[PDB]
Amino acid sequence: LTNLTPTELLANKAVDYLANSFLVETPMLGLLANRVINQKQKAIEWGAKVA
Amino acid sequence: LTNLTPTELLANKAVDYLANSFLVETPMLGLLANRVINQKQKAIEWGAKVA
């Protein structure tokens, strides 16, 4: 009938989709990302001719 | 004849032309139509990352 089927026992097959469309666009990161350097040291020293 | 062909004995065969030119454009339906999903269940479950 129309009452002996409560929602508690009804497991609707979900669509295997998540609305995971958050703002992942990272152009600043995207540029100068494939060129990041992983130093075994911790300090970055270089020279600047200033005068 | 002037009297020997009454209207009621003249068939007046019609041109086989039906004239329904009604609004039948369903472009919003046309979009997302050939990808309609016919579920065997009445419910539509999907996730949404909201945070």
Rounded Cα distance, A13 and B45, in Å:
7
Tell me, in Å, the resolution of the deposited structure: 3.3
- Cβ atoms < 10 Å from Cβ of B49: 9
Rounded Cα distance, B39 and B42, in Å:
7
Owner of token pair 């009804």: A10
Counting Cα atoms < 13 Å in the Cβ hemisphere of B34 gives 3
Which of A12, A18, A22 is facing B43, going by the closest CB pair? A12
Going by C-alpha positions, the residue among B41, B47, B38, B37 that lies closest to residue A10 is B41
Give ∠ CA A23-A26-A32 in degrees, rounded to 5: 170
Which of B37, B38, B49 would you mutate first to test chain A, the one with the most A CBs within 10 A?
Answer: B49
Q: Which technique was used to obtain these atomic coordinates?
A: cryo-EM
A3: its two tokens: 């009452």
Q: Report CA A30 to chain centroid distance, whole Å.
A: 13
Which residues on chain A place their C-beta less than 8 Å from a C-beta of chain B? 10, 12-15, 17-20, 22
Q: Which residues of B touch A7 (CB under 8 A)?
A: none
Element (H, E) at A27: helix A27-30
A28: its two tokens: 């600043």
Backbone φ and ψ for A7, nearest 5 degrees, come out as: -65, -25
